[PDB]
Amino acid sequence: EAHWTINLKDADIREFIDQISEITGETFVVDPRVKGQVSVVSKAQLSLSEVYQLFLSVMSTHGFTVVAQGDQARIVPNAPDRLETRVIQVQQSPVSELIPLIRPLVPQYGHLAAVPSANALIISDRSANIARIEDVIRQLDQKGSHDYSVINLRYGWVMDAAEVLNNAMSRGQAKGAAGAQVIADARTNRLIILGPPQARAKLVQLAQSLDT
Amino acid sequence: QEAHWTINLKDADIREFIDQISEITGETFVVDPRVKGQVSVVSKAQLSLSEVYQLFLSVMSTHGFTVVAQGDQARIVPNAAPDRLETRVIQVQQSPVSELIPLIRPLVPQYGHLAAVPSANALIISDRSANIARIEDVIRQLDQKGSHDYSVINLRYGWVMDAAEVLNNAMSRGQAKGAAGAQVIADARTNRLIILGPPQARAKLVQLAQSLDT
Amino acid sequence: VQLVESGGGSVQAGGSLRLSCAASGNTDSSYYMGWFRQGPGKEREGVASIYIRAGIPYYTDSVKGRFTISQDNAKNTIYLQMNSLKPEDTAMYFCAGSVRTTIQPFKGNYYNYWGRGTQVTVS
Amino acid sequence: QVQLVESGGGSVQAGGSLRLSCAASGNTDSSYYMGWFRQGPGKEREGVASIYIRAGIPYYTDSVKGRFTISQDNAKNTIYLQMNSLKPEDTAMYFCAGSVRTTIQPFKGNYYNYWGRGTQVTVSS
């Protein structure tokens, strides 16, 4: 039952590989083209298999793939890189349900993976966006069953509608039904409306309003 | 003027598919000896060179292989399921493909593959032939509509297939003089129902599912 | 190996014709059967194609939604029902067979077995 | 060259509480983790809590989670262990160690470098 905690800041990719090799016991033949700096933040202690899933996520994020050439593992390249890889512990919600809601926040250059054995998320992004995503995970974690409504936007811009709907859930501009959540999927220009059933039905209509 | 190709294969060698991709794309591949198997490809749509390359990656991914660019040279290598899987290229006519993916992903298994070709407004589906026929029937029902705004209901004590069989049976038994065709998609893997249709119609069907949840 | 065409003729704009293409010889080894139009002073450019095994139709944009490629594996013939015919559609129609699994279906180089032709005139 | 001093130990009844303290002598800038370890008579040395100094990231063993809380004060250069709902199993000599390694197993002493002397904690029936 060995649990490890990987914490790095601008550490060499080759040092991260040496640490993975120390944990896993697996020996890697690093290609010379494999170079760069990695930042890792472990909010959770991880199992060896969980550590291996982290390794793959870091490798995928920086443009490297693992090749098993005759029972011998080899890291080879693919075809902002000051990206952070965080291991976030989800407490009350099953991680798998959570990914559909978090994927819209992770960019194309980013990475998002589930570690169900540890009920944790591996996300690679910019540090400032990771802080935002963890604030989303925290808000989500509370609710029991994440039933949502999806609104595909025709005239409006998702990020405009999302900021508007969330700002309207306050004092100067009120919604009328709070405890609801807006998650913006830029890739498909759609809003994922969450929260209590009564609250969620109100927020849907407010997004429609803008679709005129 | 832009060249369009139609890849159709039935239990053809993976190496033959790669030779065909190399014939279309012009890209030369260094196939690893561990790369073996049989592939079935069905093109319901003609594809451009870029669209053919996205198909190639999808087939690669489905069979457990990855493309590596080792010193300006492309190389197919095995990477970290039913015997014979089919890859189909399906043409979506009235709906933007990007909108239909989410609805269709719940029907595609873990071993399967589902990708969008927005430049061709087509779907690349890797699954078993019997399931592909089912997903195609869902795509057809989805296509012939206006909106793809849907509600997801995670079922706590009810069985998704019971609720889906009941909701569609309530649907088929009767519907108003006005046209408001709703759709139920059952995700057994996660025990939920995806409800589709007009916004007013949907909210009604949502409540009917909650009453069966027990 | 040899294809026979029929069904051509002279029609007014907005009209229709059904072309037939009968095959005899080595039929099993042909995956595709298409329709090409060789207009006078115009390049050979394909219009409709069918994947025999699964009856998969492919159409060019110019003819899509107006033309329909069909087959009868029993009668071993191909059909091209041309609808909403424009005067641009006037050409010598050819029918070709392809022995290849993959191909650019609207390019003659990919086709082996050929036929004589049928004149189609739209006024 | 960073010495550590422990205080806060004592004798308490079951269901009680103690606040253990661990003062660092030099600068924690050359040490990523500061953890708490305990040894019981006839029991092997085991880790209980650990904190990644730079970001204040806490780690706990299942047997201590939801009872104990590892905290820090970088200004006062001390790390704390707020021990609550204390069971008699919790009776042991508590040690506090520093780690100069970036990635370790936060509950295994081999990964740590400087160690303290200790504080006796006794929980009775």
Numbering used by the authors:
A (entry chain B): 50 to 128, 141 to 273
B (entry chain A): 49 to 128, 140 to 273
C (entry chain C): 2 to 124
D (entry chain D): 1 to 125
Give the published text.
As part of a project to generate camel antibodies against Xcp T2SS components, we identified a specific nanobody (vHH04) directed against XcpQN. Further affinity measurement using biolayer interferometry (BLi) revealed a dissociation constant (KD) of 5.6 µM between vHH04 and XcpQN012. In order to precisely define the vHH04 binding site on its antigen XcpQN012, we solved the crystal structure of the vHH04-XcpQN012 complex to a resolution of 2.9 Å. The vHH04 binding site involved mostly electrostatics and hydrophobic contacts and was limited to the β1 and β3 strands of the N0 subdomain. The interface between vHH04 and XcpQN012 buries 510 Å2 in agreement with the relatively weak affinity determined by BLi experiments. The crystal structure superimposition of XcpQN012 dimers with or without vHH04 showed that the binding of vHH04 does not induce significant conformational changes in the XcpQN012 dimer. This structural information together with previous SEC interference data suggests that the N0 subdomain is involved in the hexamerization of XcpQN012 dimers. Considering the vHH04 binding site on the secretin and its properties of interference with XcpP binding, we are proposing a similar positioning for XcpP at the periphery of the XcpQN01 subdomain.
In Pseudomonas aeruginosa, the Xcp T2SS plays an important role in bacterial virulence by its capacity to deliver a large panel of toxins and degradative enzymes into the surrounding environment. Secretins are large homooligomeric assemblies of 12 to 16 monomers forming a distinctive bipartite ring-shaped and cylindrical structure on their C- and N-terminal sides, respectively. The periplasmic N domain of secretins is constituted by the succession of structurally independent subdomains labeled N0 to N3 (7–9). Here, we revealed that the N-terminal domain of the T2SS secretin XcpQ from Pseudomonas aeruginosa is able to self-assemble into a hexamer of dimers independently of its C-terminal domain.
